[PDB]
């Protein structure tokens, strides 16, 4: 029998804590004298300079290995097809194995174990890959297999006797060449990223060529016109064998540029690619265009190779290199425009247009729509005015063919200025005159305005952009005129225009060159890693490593301290601190005794020793180890062969038992290995004294992971011993010990409130109850940072005299300027009405914005592990949760939904579907986070347009979501409920933050001993790995599809069954109305009733029969109803593209226009069909579509309600405008309600099942039939 408090201590969770370090005594002084911080940055900067140089070895070697790859991808394609064909778990595992096989085939080119290459070439790669992740990179040996310059050689020697600084970097480069299913790797990018894209490209290609064969020669011309793949036809680049030549970045770039085309410098025609050719063919809007548009018509570009440098054949602008370079160069080009008098020449040309012949001044067709939008009401007016005047001068019977010829002519021909004026009216000339002088005056007012001295201030950046906008505005104006000699251009005008047009041409690149520099991020100060010339600083906390790592911890009178022991005179000298009797003044110094993962440390210290492996290469006799063993440990060939099988799975692993299938052999090898580890642990110096009597006999462990999950907690112990006070002050004065105080806001002197959750982890780690039984472990590989300084009366409360209501942001800064007596104008009306109810604080001490960044500070990052008694990973976590849910049928459900007018909307229901609580999370704690987020995004968009600093919105999102995470888990724990989400910005981040919080949930008000306390965290969600590897369920979290959660009637489950893309023409609309049985007027109730059988109109439905065989759709009588607050609204009102529609009144109007008698309950449909009015039937169909549109919304009105078109078995038509709290209050509440109900389906189907496995996915038909069977 399970309980809710049983979901604790199920798997380990690792977190990192951050603190500030406060130097003590002479600590800060000795560091400045030894130059540690100075050389820590220099070594940091040498790393950043050397990293790209070292990457040349990886990039070159990886690129060289990928050039010889030749594989047959036919098997991989068949596994992809079979998984898309049948969605069974057998085809998934077949594809996963097939991908792993191909990843290893690529990996064998790196390590040199592929049968495709000869032994001489195959062995040469192994000699490189061996020393590819250690100090052999710096020998130049690997580069000798593939010449260093003096500065590079000087950079290599900067890490002499210090190559451990690249320790984590070595792991990042193993992630590049790894064969595992990790996205950081090259084999994964080839097999699972680019090939499915390339395989899809081949299918898109052949489908287009078969339907439109003319597209074949057209694609071939694009390939020949660019010059890519000259030795390969267009059909072969869309065949599988060519993908072997698409494994390097240069080939991937050429492949992507065949799809995307090539751009020259700005302002010139671009080389089109395959996707642009298809896009233009569709925009012709002919019969062929509709066929191409029906098929897939966009090839997918391949992803880049890992670590590779992207190449492009397009033009890259020259980058301005300094601040004054843009001022000196622009002012030089700016002062050149005065001497040439290009403004006076331009002002004279546009003044010529008042008297010269305008029938020879031509406007470009590529600019006609832009000019129409800049001088007239819309882009349409000019093209339409020319259309009407040209139709006005056609000859004879103006057919519709002659009109289409006039339309097509206006798309691709230059119009003379006279025909535009004669067709648009005199008001265009006034618009042309006003716009021309407006642009000319701004350019004239900008050439004489001097540039600033520097670009330091934003006000100086603005005037540079303002003058460039005026220059680009004149450059834009000149491009209005046609340049092609196909038109009869004026002799003098075309020569003078082309002259000043080419003299304004460099201004376009100056705009882009200036923006590419002025919008660059300013230099900011960043924290950097400290080492104190110790390559393994704070690597581990063990007592055997205190001299090597030079880091220990103290706790004195509730305060925590970090001690650093630097090298004295370039030599290590472990200043042995002497434990002393208690009560003597000093610090409780921690003694950290730890033996790491036994799965690797025991083989490392015994069975994998070089002497053991070498001995068993020749001899079969046992070998006895004596070094670091209190008694000799025996290694037999039977034991050595178990951990060195030469078969991929070791015989004591579950993989061997699951692959082979012999339980007699598996349980024998498992028992013989556990007995060997017990023999090791009893004799090894680090573990011989550890009492392991709690471990059960070896033959009782079912698998090895279960044994290691019980052994590792016994290999870690922490204890404290008092140290002499006088001994540390000596070690601090001499400089042999640097002492800091591990500090945060909860250790300030004035601190008196609740602690931060991270500090409860910290104090709980060192609580005496945790030292006896370890729940939280202190982990190694900590880091120290040093970030320099970054930045450089009366105060006002944000809330009123009552603490609940806040001052609006528009009135806060105005009141703060007033109480400080620095407001330079009259105080506004409402701000003066809020004056008496305002709370003012007197500045008793300076409170400085961003105080941490104004001074230099040290920082300390240390990782910990919670739930240390549990295993590293859980086993059957979802099945453990589902076992609880079957024993707790009344577990409520919390449905979280992403709304259209709400960031997050939640709805809590009980086990039977009744709503218990519904709320929008746009605002929480009386703060509108939606408006703040939306106003922040507007500011960031305007910042990019104004070349200002953009800023950060991710810090505002996390702060909002944290308040959301707090509110959701409270509802989760109070209700012991299940959270349901949508299956796929603000919502994606909320999902991860919710899983992480429930992976290791600690409530700061619970006592440490209780479930939920710091020593017994809650674990409600499955262990997070990645989003791709996650399924439908993660513990108490569930994911359901979003379709049919909003536009669904919460009283019946009804949805709109028809797809309106198929009801397109008159004959289809007539057959659609013939599928309905009757439509008549109810005299008593006053509304219309439309009866529809679900088995009719099958060609117009979405294929979802649901559960009801028929439905009574009603045209609700447009009465005036009132909600629970007395606010009026019209029943049946619909909002369509917006306008308000009243269908029942619009229907009565239609029937009276046709004289159709309906007040006798007569069936109306046969009368409309027999009369066969084209306009009346199309209106009748539109009315039905409006009635079936439940979700009616208009942003300006604030409306977003659900109004059901069907009446339930209880005679009610649901309308969220009644504001009944028992039911959804709007459309977003209706989504969250039905999301929780989709999760209820999963829990309802779990109890009827005999297994503990949830059903994967919810089909729309199973959901509609389920929810309709319930409500009817």
Partner DNA sequence: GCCAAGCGCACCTAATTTCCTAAAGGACTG
Partner DNA sequence: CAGTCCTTTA
Partner RNA sequence: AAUUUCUACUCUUGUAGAUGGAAAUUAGGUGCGCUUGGCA
The C-alpha atoms of residue 1266 and residue 1040 are separated, in whole angstroms, by 14
CB of 318 to DNA, least distance (A): 10
In the window 956-995, what residues touch RNA (CB under 7 A)?
A: 956, 958-960, 962-963, 965-966, 993
Among 144, 397, 610, 825, contact with DNA (rule: CB under 7 A): 610
Cβ distance to Na ion smaller for residue 477 or 760? 760
Among 77, 263, 275, 644, contact with RNA (rule: CB under 7 A): 263
In the window 679-708, what residues touch DNA (CB under 7 A)?
A: 685-686
- Please check whether residue 197 is in contact with residue 313, taking contact to mean a CB–CB distance below 8 angstroms: no
The C-alpha atoms of residue 1108 and residue 566 are separated, in whole angstroms, by 80
Catalytic residues: 798, 849, 897, 982, 1191, 1228
Size of the site for DNA (CB under 7 A): 110
**Residue 391 is inside which H or E element, if any?**
helix 380-391
CB of 646 to RNA, least distance (A): 32
Ligand-binding annotation for 755, yes or no, is yes
Cβ distance to RNA smaller for residue 2 or 797? 797
Cβ distance to DNA smaller for residue 780 or 1057? 780
Phi, psi angles (nearest 5°) of residue 474: -70, -40
The C-alpha atoms of residue 313 and residue 259 are separated, in whole angstroms, by 13
CB of 176 to DNA, least distance (A): 10
Part of the chain binding RNA (CB under 7 A), chosen from 102-110, 262-270, 696-704, 1129-1137: 262-270
Among 863, 874, 1041, 1257, contact with DNA (rule: CB under 7 A): 863
Residue 1103: CB atoms within 10 Å:
9
- Please check whether residue 751 is in contact with residue 745, taking contact to mean a CB–CB distance below 8 angstroms: yes
In the window 154-183, what residues touch DNA (CB under 7 A)?
A: 159, 161-165, 167-168, 171-172, 174-175, 180-183
CB of 481 to DNA, least distance (A): 18
Q: Is residue 1012 at the binding interface for DNA, with CB under 7 A as the rule?
A: no
Residue 859: CB atoms within 10 Å:
17
In the window 365-384, what residues touch DNA (CB under 7 A)?
A: 369-370, 373-374, 379
CB of 834 to RNA, least distance (A): 13
Compute, in degrees rounded to 10, the torsion defined by CA atoms 641, 643, 648, 654: 120
Of the candidates 1018, 1047, 1052, the one whose C-alpha atom is nearest the C-alpha of residue 1035 is 1018
Ligand-binding annotation for 751, yes or no, is yes
Ligand-binding annotation for 1184, yes or no, is no
Ligand-binding annotation for 218, yes or no, is no
- Please check whether residue 795 is in contact with residue 841, taking contact to mean a CB–CB distance below 8 angstroms: yes
Q: Is residue 172 at the binding interface for RNA, with CB under 7 A as the rule?
A: yes
The C-alpha atoms of residue 297 and residue 286 are separated, in whole angstroms, by 16
Own/partner contacts of 667-676, CB < 8 Å, gap of 24 or more, are: 667/699, 669/642, 670/701, 670/703, 670/704, 671/698, 671/699, 671/701, 672/638, 672/639, 672/642, 673/639, 673/642, 673/643, 673/704, 674/698, 674/701, 674/704, 674/707, 676/639
Ligand-binding annotation for 750, yes or no, is yes
CB of 375 to DNA, least distance (A): 9
Q: Is residue 296 at the binding interface for DNA, with CB under 7 A as the rule?
A: no
Q: Is residue 245 at the binding interface for RNA, with CB under 7 A as the rule?
A: no
Among 126, 225, 280, 949, contact with RNA (rule: CB under 7 A): 280
Cβ distance to RNA smaller for residue 51 or 696? 51
Cβ distance to RNA smaller for residue 78 or 374? 374
Tell me, rounded to whole angstroms, the distance of Cα 1 from its chain centroid: 41
Return the ∠ at Cα 892 (arms to 889 and 895), rounded to 5°.
Answer: 135
Among 754, 876, 938, 1247, contact with Na ion (rule: CB under 5 A): 754
CB of 1061 to RNA, least distance (A): 13
163 binding partner (options RNA, Na ion, DNA, none; Cβ < 5 to 8 Å by kind): DNA
For every residue of 39-57, DSSP letters joined together read: HHHHHHHHHHHHHHHHHHH
Ligand-binding annotation for 899, yes or no, is no
Q: Is residue 136 at the binding interface for DNA, with CB under 7 A as the rule?
A: yes
Structure tokens at 1118: 């447009």
In the window 348-407, what residues touch RNA (CB under 7 A)?
A: 366, 369, 379-380
Ligand-binding annotation for 758, yes or no, is yes
Ligand-binding annotation for 753, yes or no, is yes
**Residue 275 is inside which H or E element, if any?**
helix 274-283
Ligand-binding annotation for 749, yes or no, is yes
411 binding partner (options Na ion, DNA, RNA, none; Cβ < 5 to 8 Å by kind): RNA
Q: Is residue 797 at the binding interface for RNA, with CB under 7 A as the rule?
A: yes
Among 188, 513, 857, 1207, contact with RNA (rule: CB under 7 A): 857
Q: Is residue 193 at the binding interface for DNA, with CB under 7 A as the rule?
A: no
CB of 777 to DNA, least distance (A): 7
With residues binned 3-state (H G I as helix, E B as strand, rest as coil), the percentages for the chain, rounded to 5, are 50, 15, 40
Q: Is residue 753 at the binding interface for Na ion, with CB under 5 A as the rule?
A: yes
In the window 1214-1243, what residues touch DNA (CB under 7 A)?
A: none
Cβ distance to DNA smaller for residue 566 or 1050? 566
Structure tokens at 920: 């929008």
Q: Is residue 661 at the binding interface for Na ion, with CB under 5 A as the rule?
A: no
Q: Does residue 191 sit in helix, strand or coil?
A: helix
Contacts of 529 (CB under 8 A, 6+ apart): 40, 44, 783, 784, 785
Part of the chain binding RNA (CB under 7 A), chosen from 269-277, 661-669, 727-735, 1086-1094: 269-277
- Please check whether residue 908 is in contact with residue 893, taking contact to mean a CB–CB distance below 8 angstroms: yes
Part of the chain binding DNA (CB under 7 A), chosen from 77-85, 385-393, 412-420, 606-614: 606-614
In the window 736-795, what residues touch DNA (CB under 7 A)?
A: 777, 779-781
In the window 1053-1112, what residues touch RNA (CB under 7 A)?
A: none
Q: Is residue 411 at the binding interface for RNA, with CB under 7 A as the rule?
A: yes
- Please check whether residue 590 is in contact with residue 577, taking contact to mean a CB–CB distance below 8 angstroms: no
- Please check whether residue 77 is in contact with residue 95, taking contact to mean a CB–CB distance below 8 angstroms: no
Provide the sign of the torsion angle of the four alpha carbons 480, 484, 485, 487, taken in this order.
Answer: negative
Q: How far is CA 1119 from CA 368, 1080, 1082, 1134, 1142, in A?
A: 51, 19, 15, 13, 10
Provide the sign of the torsion angle of the four alpha carbons 177, 182, 183, 189, taken in this order.
Answer: positive
Q: Does residue 1189 sit in helix, strand or coil?
A: coil
- Please check whether residue 1014 is in contact with residue 776, taking contact to mean a CB–CB distance below 8 angstroms: yes
Part of the chain binding DNA (CB under 7 A), chosen from 386-394, 471-479, 499-507, 516-524: 516-524
Among 3, 5, 14, 525, contact with RNA (rule: CB under 7 A): 14
Q: Is residue 914 at the binding interface for Na ion, with CB under 5 A as the rule?
A: no
CB of 712 to DNA, least distance (A): 10
Q: Is residue 600 at the binding interface for DNA, with CB under 7 A as the rule?
A: yes
Ligand-binding annotation for 992, yes or no, is no
757 binding partner (options DNA, RNA, Na ion, none; Cβ < 5 to 8 Å by kind): RNA
Among 1025, 1065, 1120, 1210, contact with DNA (rule: CB under 7 A): 1025
The C-alpha atoms of residue 862 and residue 17 are separated, in whole angstroms, by 5
**Residue 328 is inside which H or E element, if any?**
helix 323-340
Cβ distance to RNA smaller for residue 879 or 958? 958
- Where helices occur in 6-35 by DSSP H, the ranges are 27-34
Please report where in the chains the tokens 């919502």 appear, as a residue. 987
Structure tokens at 157: 């020697």
Q: How far is CA 415 from CA 355, 359, 384, 432, 806, in A?
A: 19, 9, 13, 15, 61
In the window 301-340, what residues touch RNA (CB under 7 A)?
A: 303-308
Q: Is residue 818 at the binding interface for RNA, with CB under 7 A as the rule?
A: no
Size of the site for Na ion (CB under 5 A): 2
- Please check whether residue 790 is in contact with residue 525, taking contact to mean a CB–CB distance below 8 angstroms: yes
Q: Which residues bind Na ion (CB under 5 A)?
A: 753-754
Binding site residue list: 47-51, 172-173, 304-307, 749-758, 795-797
Give binding residues for crRNA as ranges: 47-51, 172-173, 304-307, 749-758, 795-797
């Amino acid at each position: 029998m399970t309980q809710f408090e049983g979901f604790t201590n199920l798997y380990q969770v690792s977190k990192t804590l951050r603190f500030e370090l406060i130097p003590q005594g002479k600590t800060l002084k000795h560091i400045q004298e030894q130059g540690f911080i100075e050389e820590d940055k220099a070594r940091n900067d040498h790393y950043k300079e050397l990293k790209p140089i070292i990457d040349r070895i990886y990039k070159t070697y990886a690129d060289q290995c990928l050039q010889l790859v030749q594989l047959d991808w036919e098997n991989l394609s068949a596994a992809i097809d079979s998984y898309r064909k049948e969605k069974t778990e057998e085809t998934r595992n077949a594809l996963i194995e097939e991908q792993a096989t191909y990843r290893n085939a690529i990996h064998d080119y790196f390590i040199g174990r592929t049968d495709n290459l000869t032994d001489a070439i195959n062995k040469r790669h192994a000699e490189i890959y061996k020393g590819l992740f250690k100090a052999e990179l710096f020998n130049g040996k690997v580069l000798k297999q593939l010449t260093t310059t003096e500065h590079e050689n000087a950079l290599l020697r900067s890490f002499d006797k210090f190559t451990t600084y690249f320790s984590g970097f070595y792991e990042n480069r193993k992630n590049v060449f790894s064969a595992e299913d990790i996205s950081t790797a090259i084999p994964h990018r080839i097999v699972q990223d680019n090939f499915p894209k390339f395989k899809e490209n081949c299918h898109i290609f052949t489908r287009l060529i078969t339907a439109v064969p003319s597209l074949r020669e057209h694609f071939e011309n694009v390939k020949k016109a660019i010059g890519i793949f000259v030795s390969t036809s267009i059909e072969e680049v869309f065949s599988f064998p060519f993908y072997n030549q698409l494994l390097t970045q240069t080939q991937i770039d050429l492949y992507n540029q065949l799809l995307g085309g090539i751009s020259r410098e700005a302002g010139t025609e671009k080389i089109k690619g395959l996707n642009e050719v298809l896009n233009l063919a569709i925009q012709k809007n002919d019969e062929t265009a509709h066929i191409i548009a029906s098929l897939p018509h966009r090839f997918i570009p391949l992803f880049k190779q890992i670590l590779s440098d992207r190449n492009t054949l397009s033009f890259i602008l020259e980058e301005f290199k300094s601040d004054e370079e843009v001022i000196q160069s622009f002012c030089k080009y700016k002062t050149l425009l005065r001497n040439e008098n290009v403004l006076e020449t331009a002002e004279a040309l546009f003044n010529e247009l008042n008297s010269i012949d305008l029938t020879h001044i031509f406007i470009s067709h590529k600019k006609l729509e832009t000019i129409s939008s800049a001088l007239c009401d819309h882009w349409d007016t000019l093209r339409n005015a020319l259309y009407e005047r040209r139709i006005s001068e056609l000859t004879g019977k103006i057919t519709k063919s002659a009109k289409e010829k006039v339309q097509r002519s206006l798309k691709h021909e230059d119009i003379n200025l006279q025909e535009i004026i004669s067709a648009a009216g005199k008001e265009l000339s006034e618009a042309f005159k006003q716009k021309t002088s407006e642009i000319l005056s701004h350019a004239h007012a900008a050439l004489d305005q001097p540039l600033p001295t520097t670009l330091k201030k934003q006000e100086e950046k603005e005037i540079l952009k303002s003058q460039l906008d005026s220059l680009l505005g004149l450059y834009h104006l000149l491009d209005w005129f046609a340049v092609d000699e196909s038109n009869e251009v004026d002799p003098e005008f075309s020569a003078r225009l082309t002259g000043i047009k080419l003299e304004m041409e460099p201004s376009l690149s100056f705009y882009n060159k200036a923006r590419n520099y002025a919008t660059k991020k300013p230099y900011s100060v960043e924290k950097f890693k400290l080492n104190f010339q110790m390559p393994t600083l704070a690597s581990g906390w063990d007592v055997n490593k205190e001299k090597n790592n030079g880091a220990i911890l103290f706790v004195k009178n509730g305060l925590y301290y970090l001690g650093i022991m630097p090298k004295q005179k370039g030599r290590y000298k472990a200043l042995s601190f002497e434990p002393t009797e208690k009560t003597s003044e000093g610090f409780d110094k921690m003694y950290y005794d730890y033996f790491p993962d036994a799965a690797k440390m025991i083989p490392k210290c015994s069975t994998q020793l070089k002497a053991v492996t070498a001995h068993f290469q020749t001899h079969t006799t046992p070998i006895l180890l004596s070094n670091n063993f209190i008694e000799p440990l025996e290694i037999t060939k039977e034991i050595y062969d178990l951990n060195n099988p030469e078969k991929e799975p070791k015989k004591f692993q579950t993989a061997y038992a699951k692959k082979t299938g012999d339980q007699k052999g598996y349980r024998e090898a498992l028992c013989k290995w556990i007995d060997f580890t017990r023999d090791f642990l009893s004799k090894y110096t680090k573990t011989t004294s550890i009492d392991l009597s709690s471990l059960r006999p070896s033959s009782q462990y079912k698998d090895l992971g279960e044994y290691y999950a019980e052994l590792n907690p016994l290999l870690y112990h922490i204890s404290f011993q008092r140290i002499a006070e006088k001994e540390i002050m000596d070690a601090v004065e001499t400089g042999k010990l640097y002492l800091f105080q591990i500090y945060n806001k909860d250790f300030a002197k004035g601190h008196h409130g609740k602690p931060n959750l991270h500090t409860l982890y910290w104090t709980g780690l060192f609580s005496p109850e945790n030292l006896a039984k370890t729940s939280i472990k202190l982990n190694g590989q900590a880091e120290l940072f040093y970030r320099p300084k970054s930045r450089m009366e009366k105060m006002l409360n944000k809330k009123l005299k009552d603490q609940k209501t806040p001052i609006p942001d528009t009135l806060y800064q105005e009141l703060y300027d007033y109480v400080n007596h620095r407001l330079s104008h009259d105080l506004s009306d409402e701000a003066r009405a809020l004056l008496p109810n305002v709370i003012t604080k007197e500045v008793s001490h300076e409170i400085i914005k961003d105080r941490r960044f104004t001074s230099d500070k040290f920082f300390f990052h240390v990782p910990i592990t919670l739930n240390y008694q549990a295993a590293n990973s859980p086993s059957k976590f979802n099945q453990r949760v589902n076992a609880y849910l079957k024993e707790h049928p009344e577990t409520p459900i919390i449905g979280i939904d992403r709304g259209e007018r709400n960031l997050i909307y939640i709805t809590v229901i009980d086990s039977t579907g009744k709503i218990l609580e519904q709320r929008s999370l746009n605002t929480i704690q009386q703060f509108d986070y939606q408006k703040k987020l939306d106003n922040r995004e507007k500011e960031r968009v305007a910042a990019r347009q104004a070349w200002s600093v953009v800023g950060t919105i991710k810090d505002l999102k996390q702060g909002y979501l944290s308040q959301v995470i707090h509110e959701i888990v409270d509802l989760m724990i109070h209700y012991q409920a299940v959270v349901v989400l949508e299956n796929l910005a603000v919502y994606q981040q909320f999902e991860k933050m919710l899983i992480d919080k429930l992976n290791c949930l600690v409530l700061k008000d619970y006592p440490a001993e209780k479930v939920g306390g710091v020593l017994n965290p809650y674990q409600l969600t499955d262990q997070f790995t990645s989003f791709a590897k996650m399924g439908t369920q993660s513990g108490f979290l569930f994911y359901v599809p979003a379709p049919y959660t909003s536009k669904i009637d919460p009283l019946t489950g009804f949805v709109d069954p028809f797809v309106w893309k198929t009801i397109k023409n008159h004959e289809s609309r007539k057959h659609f109305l013939e599928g309905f049985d009757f439509l008549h007027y109810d005299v008593k109730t006053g509304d219309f009733i439309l009866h529809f059988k679900m088995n009719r109109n099958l060609s117009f439905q979405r294929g979802l029969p649901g559960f009801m065989p028929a439905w009574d759709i009603v045209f609700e009588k447009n009465e005036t109803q009132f909600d629970a607050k007395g606010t009026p609204f019209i029943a049946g009102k619909r909002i369509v593209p917006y306008r308000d529609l009243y269908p029942a009144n619009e229907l009565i109007a239609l029937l009276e226009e046709k004289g159709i008698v309906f007040r006798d309950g007569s069936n109306i449909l046969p009368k409309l069909l027999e009369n066969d009015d084209s306009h009346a039937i199309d209106t009748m169909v539109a009315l039905i579509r409006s009635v079936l549109q439940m979700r009616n919304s208009n942003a300006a009105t604030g409306e977003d309600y659900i109004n059901s078109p069907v009446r339930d078995l209880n005679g009610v038509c649901f309308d969220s405008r009644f504001q009944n709290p028992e039911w959804p209050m709007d459309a977003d509440a209706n989504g969250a309600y039905h999301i929780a109900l989709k999760g209820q389906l999963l829990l309802n189907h779990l109890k009827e099942s005999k297994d503990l496995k949830l059903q994967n996915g919810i089909s729309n038909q199973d959901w509609l039939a389920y929810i309709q069977e319930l409500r009817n």
